[PDB]
Amino acid sequence: SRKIAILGYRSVGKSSLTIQFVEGQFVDSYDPTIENTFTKLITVNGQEYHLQLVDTAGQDEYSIFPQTYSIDINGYILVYSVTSIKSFEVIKVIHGKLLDMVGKVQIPIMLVGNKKDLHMERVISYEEGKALAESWNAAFLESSAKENQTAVDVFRRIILEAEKIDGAA
């Protein structure tokens, strides 16, 4: 049982992949940007896995200081956009600090790149992102809400690293 926190700029497509991922199905999904908690129970290798993710925007991209973000999770999935130097740079910021705040051990970190159909432009480099995810020992993933297959790939790849990071902490 681990809850993964979602950190994605505005209209980055959080709610889109949150619904497409959790359900594992690309549905119409065309609502505003409401915050909430989601859940996804699945079995990997016969082993049960219960994940719960949240999409919030209290103040900052996610606010490091007390602001309803004092949840009790055990995961983190930051969504970076292949078009918003803002989405990926802030994600790298909130992380640096956040990490610095908890000063804990290796926790499940997932760097997912949403809005893949935009990658056609790819403003951020797969590398820079690689070195980043490698820095925190996180996994770098690039998918699209409008695409299930990609999502799925993010579901397995994450649970996987989730395993490694678990061995550490």
- Please report, as ranges, the residues that interact with ligand GDP according to CB under 6 A: 8, 10-16, 33, 114-115, 117-118, 144-146
**Where is the binding site for GTP, in residues?**
11, 13-16, 27, 30, 33, 114, 117, 145
> Which residue in 33, 36, 37, 67 binds Mg ion (CB under 5 A)?
33
Estimate the crossing angle of helix 85-102 against helix 126-136, to 10 degrees.
Answer: 10
> Which residue in 5, 7, 12, 15 binds Mg ion (CB under 5 A)?
15
In a 10 Å sphere around its CB, with 0-12 CB exposed, 13-18 middle and 19+ buried, how is residue 49 labelled? middle
Reduced DSSP (H G I as helix, E B as strand, rest coil) percent helix, strand, coil of the chain, to 5: 35, 25, 40
Select the binding partner of residue 148 from Mg ion, ligand GDP, none (C-beta < 5 to 8 A, by kind).
none
CB of 85 to ligand GDP, least distance (A): 16
CB of 22 to Mg ion, least distance (A): 14
H-only helix segments in 50-147 = 85-102, 126-136
